[PDB]
Design a protein around this ligand. Sequence first.
Ligand SMILES: O=C(O)[C@@](O)(COP(=O)(O)O)[C@H](O)[C@H](O)COP(=O)(O)O
Ligand SMILES: O=C(O)[C@@](O)(COP(=O)(O)O)[C@H](O)[C@H](O)COP(=O)(O)O
Ligand SMILES: O=C(O)[C@@](O)(COP(=O)(O)O)[C@H](O)[C@H](O)COP(=O)(O)O
Ligand SMILES: [Mn+2]
Ligand SMILES: [Mn+2]
Ligand SMILES: [Mn+2]
Lengths: 467, 467, 151, 316, 123, 123
Amino acid sequence: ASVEFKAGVKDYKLTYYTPEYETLDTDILAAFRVSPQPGVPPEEAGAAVAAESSTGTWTTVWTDGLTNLDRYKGRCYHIEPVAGEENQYICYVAYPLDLFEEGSVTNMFTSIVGNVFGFKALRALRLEDLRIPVAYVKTFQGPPHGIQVERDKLNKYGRPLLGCTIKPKLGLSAKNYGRAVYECLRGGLDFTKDDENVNSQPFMRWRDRFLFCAEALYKAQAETGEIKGHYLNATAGTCEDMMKRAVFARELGVPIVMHDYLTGGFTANTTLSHYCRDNGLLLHIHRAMHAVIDRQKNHGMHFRVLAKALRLSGGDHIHSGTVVGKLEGERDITLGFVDLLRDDYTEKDRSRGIYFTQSWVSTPGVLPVASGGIHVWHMPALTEIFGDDSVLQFGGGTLGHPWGNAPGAVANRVALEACVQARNEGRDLAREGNTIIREATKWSPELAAACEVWKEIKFEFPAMDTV
Amino acid sequence: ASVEFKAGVKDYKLTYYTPEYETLDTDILAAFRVSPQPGVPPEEAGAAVAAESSTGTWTTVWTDGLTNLDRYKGRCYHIEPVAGEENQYICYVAYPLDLFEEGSVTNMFTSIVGNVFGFKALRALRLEDLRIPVAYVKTFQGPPHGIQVERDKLNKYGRPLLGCTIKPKLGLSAKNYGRAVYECLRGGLDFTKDDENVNSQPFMRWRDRFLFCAEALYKAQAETGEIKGHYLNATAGTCEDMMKRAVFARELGVPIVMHDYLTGGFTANTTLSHYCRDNGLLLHIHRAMHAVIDRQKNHGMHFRVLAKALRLSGGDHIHSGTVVGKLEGERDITLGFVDLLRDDYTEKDRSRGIYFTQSWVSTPGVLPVASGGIHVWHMPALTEIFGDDSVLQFGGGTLGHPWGNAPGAVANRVALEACVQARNEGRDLAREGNTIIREATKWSPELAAACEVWKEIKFEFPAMDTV
Amino acid sequence: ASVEFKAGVKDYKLTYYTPEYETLDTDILAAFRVSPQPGVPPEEAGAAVAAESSTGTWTTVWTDGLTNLDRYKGRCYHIEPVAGEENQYICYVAYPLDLFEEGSVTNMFTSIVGNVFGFKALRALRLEDLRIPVAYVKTFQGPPHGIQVER
Amino acid sequence: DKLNKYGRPLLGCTIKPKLGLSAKNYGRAVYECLRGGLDFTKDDENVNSQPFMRWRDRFLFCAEALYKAQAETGEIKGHYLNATAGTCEDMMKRAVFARELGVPIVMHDYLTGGFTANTTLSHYCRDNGLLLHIHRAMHAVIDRQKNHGMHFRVLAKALRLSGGDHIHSGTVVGKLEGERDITLGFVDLLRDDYTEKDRSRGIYFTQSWVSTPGVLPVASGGIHVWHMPALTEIFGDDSVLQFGGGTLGHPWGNAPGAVANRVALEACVQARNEGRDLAREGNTIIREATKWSPELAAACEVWKEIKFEFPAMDTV
Amino acid sequence: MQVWPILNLKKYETLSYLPPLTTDQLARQVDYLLNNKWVPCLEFETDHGFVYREHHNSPGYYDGRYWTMWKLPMFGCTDPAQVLNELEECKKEYPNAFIRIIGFDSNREVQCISFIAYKPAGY
Amino acid sequence: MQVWPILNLKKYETLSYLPPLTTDQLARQVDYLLNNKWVPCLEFETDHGFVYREHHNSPGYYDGRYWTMWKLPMFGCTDPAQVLNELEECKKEYPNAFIRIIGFDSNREVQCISFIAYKPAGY
Ligand SMILES: O=C(O)[C@@](O)(COP(=O)(O)O)[C@H](O)[C@H](O)COP(=O)(O)O
Ligand SMILES: O=C(O)[C@@](O)(COP(=O)(O)O)[C@H](O)[C@H](O)COP(=O)(O)O
Ligand SMILES: O=C(O)[C@@](O)(COP(=O)(O)O)[C@H](O)[C@H](O)COP(=O)(O)O
Ligand SMILES: [Mn+2]
Ligand SMILES: [Mn+2]
Ligand SMILES: [Mn+2]
């Protein structure tokens, strides 16, 4: 069992490249896109990434003999050349289950992406996908409530839900924030929300905002007869402050709070998810700062990973991009991480970005949220890409309307219900979408007015991370 | 006076590009490397970044008329083209102080970095530098203890502090983990380290490790008669668990604990840093995941931005790079941000990466920590690059010695002290470093052993992020 | 650069009267109406107020060599006489920001206004106006709601 | 009784410079002062928690220092750790850590802190066996002038009620203003159960304290060894004498500066016990002690002709 | 500049920083005690000369403040020589004990005088 | 492989693992102190040369970090010789005490040098 100790710097491939190994079902699997520095073999790169993300250091250490390293070491088991790219390979790594702390997305990322991405030996590194074994999935509580309970709690079925980000992003007063929310919700929107950067500020403190948003929300619910929600941001510099905001919302009896899980952190997000499940509070998750990490193909961490991390940490909603909007989202890749958020099982599909087959052992679905630079002409396409289980959020789309918010909300709700109606009668939203919007302008002046303003507005640019 | 609401999209540059603007001293200033997509004017790109990070959105909203937007809007006050580049620009954005929540690095990043990097109109976006005004600096607590109080609490003056990181990274039992710490600490190393990925796991549970590491550090301290620490990892999945580990280390009377602030998140780190201030505990910060954000010139955030944030959030130590080790390190870039962490005032130095002058109104300093692929031969260079106020960490270097840990510690202690003597006596470390190492081998049996094992080891790969 | 320690009383004005000084925006400024006792020069009284409000005592202490007193000393930067008055002057004192505890009006008053008003060499002392720096303002929560939120 | 110190006034120091010291240099200074024979050291009234020194670090370093000095002297030592703060919560956190340290004495500034926080702290010190030293900072804004304000005897009676084991009383002979007959009056109000009305001493009413404990008067502010016979004779043995500049300004250092003040005071106590009059023999008693004590002999040479004589703003 | 000694410089509260007391000086203090109508008592400790904290760390708590009483407090003692004679008696029975003289005021119920009358060898 | 000794291997922080200092080496150190413009000071301890914990177990608390100060930090000293004679005076008075030379930075108020300069016999 025991081999001598020789002090020395060995190639990582001597211990950490194992092309024969068969991946255990308990292993966490990783797909890294590895771009080695010129003159580093691909096998050494794979092994280095597996070793310093698991149990390895630059020179041989005598303590290695005290443990059974073969049981605990990360393994580069498949190397695949990326066609069209020299010195780029997709390196598959497996990690034994015992390496991970139960219920800690924090811990999982710390091992897998903590130090390896800065090694001199690699020009670039990107984590494209992870296979998380069901036995680790069962250690996380997951979404506090999830898709089924939230439709049941709100009594909302048969359509994508509708949201609106209050604008200007910053600088509104608490009272004007509430008068904004009321008019948006009285026009047929289901949800309004604080902007991601609206926390507590010298122009608007949070307890004032929460208090005003509560009144407006409830006034809107009485007039409409339809349940209403306003995401109240609990994001803060400390967890004490995060809880203080969550506690007051519970006292207010509001349905939903929001968090920015990357800028607030996975540690605090997991704290908040557990309070939400404990107090029946919905958690809407803003993905602020993901694009620093995931915009580029050569380096970083794709949103699929961070989106799975969120399902484990916990959120009832997560922004997913719009495809058609101002922010970058490629349809085929977005469709893949949408099914990763929403469904129990997703088989591997390289055409949609999915490198591994992932199962969630009944971890509830997360409701994908499309926000940013979308207007009533985008509604047919949005209904088609995301299906009924989504939330469609129009910020500029509601408040930019010429007659006001309440007319702007009617335009978006009307646009949506006409799309749902036509889809349900069998029409092709892709081909017929504009005909359906135009039809509905004949009996809705609110929609007619929204359509004249945005008729030419498109977002069409070359992408930076396609498959 | 007021201007009529006119619904429709307008160019961002019309309100958010302000070359005439003179920056207020209270404004947060941001230096962005901006790569527009084709067909986008540099001025429109810079004004788009400033808009959607502060108050703007894609279409004109009536509610702008309720506030005084000119007072709260983020502004692009300068555009400077990058050398040797076409369609890449350096855009300076100034954010008013009111936009920001006091005491929250979370909020600051949510606004400045939250959605801009995802915009379809930008090929790439990188945040190179942030100028935090002194009035915002005062709102944060900063390092719990800082450089002066930490040296005073440990009674250690006149040299860099020395540490080793226990290896293998994962897989060691708690008893064996402790046995390693004592052997390392008795040889003269000031600190031992929990690995960043070591939280609580099936192979080693955190409380057992905390307890055993405590016994080992005290026994080593009694033998040595020199104060000793071992950084215990409070990084966890929830804040409750993070705190639980921090309280136990307080029960044990040990001096130092650690956090991975990026994977734990800023919210949790600020909370921990506030706990350490209140209970006398030193807080060591590991920068895991930074390379996912900061490796590439074209896209991301520079580490100088993240290092600043940790000084504001709170930490007594922060990993700084080695320049000479396995992970990427650029001497001139590193030398700039080691000063930003260490001193009260830093003049803008474009050669050293500093885009703005930054003042810390007596915010305590952070001890820079050098770790990763460094051996005794690296000791003269390290001592010169970082100076007395640093911590050197030799995990592989200590546990890779052929005679063991206690000898492997003596080698690094003898190396540094011999380097320190030379600098005191007027020898130039860069020129004579090897000759100083070579004299020490003649009188030191342990240091000699170390020197032959690693004489030929050097990391010399071309760097991906140059000024 | 150190200076030798010499025990014994020295005049306040040598260390704490600085007509040349230019106030930083971080400094707390205070406008004191000063009435010195007979035979006390205005410069000595203004410098005595600064010294005993910030970093000074009656005699020289050795511990001053460990710190940088110039970075921490309060300074009388200006003295203007009062109209219609004799041996009454308006003394302007600048206190560095580091002297003060964040968010504590108690600390602000204990330094600026704590002991100076009882000094024998002074017939009377009034504090007329405080220039609180914005960096110190930011450390305070301020009104719980304020005028707008109240309406 | 708790400190086992009888038969003489207690000796204190105020660490100097007032602001700017690090926590560790605060503690070296505390240890050197305490080992020379001083009973108490103290945080200056403005020293709370600051960018140059945070309180918890101060509390810890000062705790190790007073224990080092107490171990080598054989005498109980105390350092007044300042509890004054911006909020009652911060005030409590400070008083709570002092208790964990098992130290004997904490301090508050009750006029800048306010009466509500001071009565809260007074109640905590009784609950936890902590002595409370009260600094009267900002009083002179109220009580210097005869025409307007409150006299300090009103504020002194208020502190005895609010609660304090020490209150600064003035030196009479020091740099701050105090008239000997007035100071003698409110000192009696601070220490005894009963004071008859004495218009000559500013006592307008007969006051009874119904067995409320007395407060120890504290004399501080521009005093040195030559002032010692006069302080001992004015205030009696139930007092605390505090030499900041007197200890830290000594040319040999703090430990010698402590020994000067402790030697001087005990030479006065012996002479008084032998029957000599401190007002009349004060210079000869200090001078005779300088022949055997070099530390006393050095300090005298430095503070020989240093006096504080000025018209008073408030006389009877 | 003379450095204050750090070793064996144990102190004994009031008058211990003064030169050692002559028998006439000790009598003077006892007379100051008697003239003030304070009750004289004698107190001796062998085991622990100086203060310590063995049993507790609580604020205000120290060990070794209490000493053993010699005989009883001499109420109604009008004669200084009794205190002196009692000292020599305490000394002869307890030569290796520190001994100190304490003065009791009934009205304030506090000791008004305490000074070390005798120190054993090595002290 | 050589086993590091267990016993009587107490150490003295910076330069202690280095071989023992020649008078020339000590002088070069104080020359490094003075040329950086730090202020030299000298510290002695007899009873507790190594750190211990007696009075508290709180984080960051230890005893024996504080040593006694020999005279006063030599402010205004440009002469290494004056520092060196000062070490000699300390030794003659305290032969059984450990003695160390330290250096103060006023700008940062942190000691910038600490090294043992004399040890009692057996050490
Ligand atoms: O802050 C904003 O700009 C938004 O409120 C959209 O504003 P409008 O609705 O007014 O355009 C969303 O947060 C962005 O879509 C971020 O989207 P995501 O993270 O999903 O990409
Ligand atoms: O796990 C590691 O690799 C280390 O413990 C060093 O290993 P060795 O001590 O065995 O070399 C450090 O945490 C890395 O330097 C982190 O990188 P960075 O400094 O960029 O944060
Ligand atoms: O700040 C000061 O000056 C002191 O620390 C004394 O310093 P020195 O010992 O160096 O003079 C005391 O607070 C005053 O004596 C208080 O005055 P009062 O008793 O009138 O309230
Ligand atoms: Mn938003
Ligand atoms: Mn590590
Ligand atoms: Mn004071």
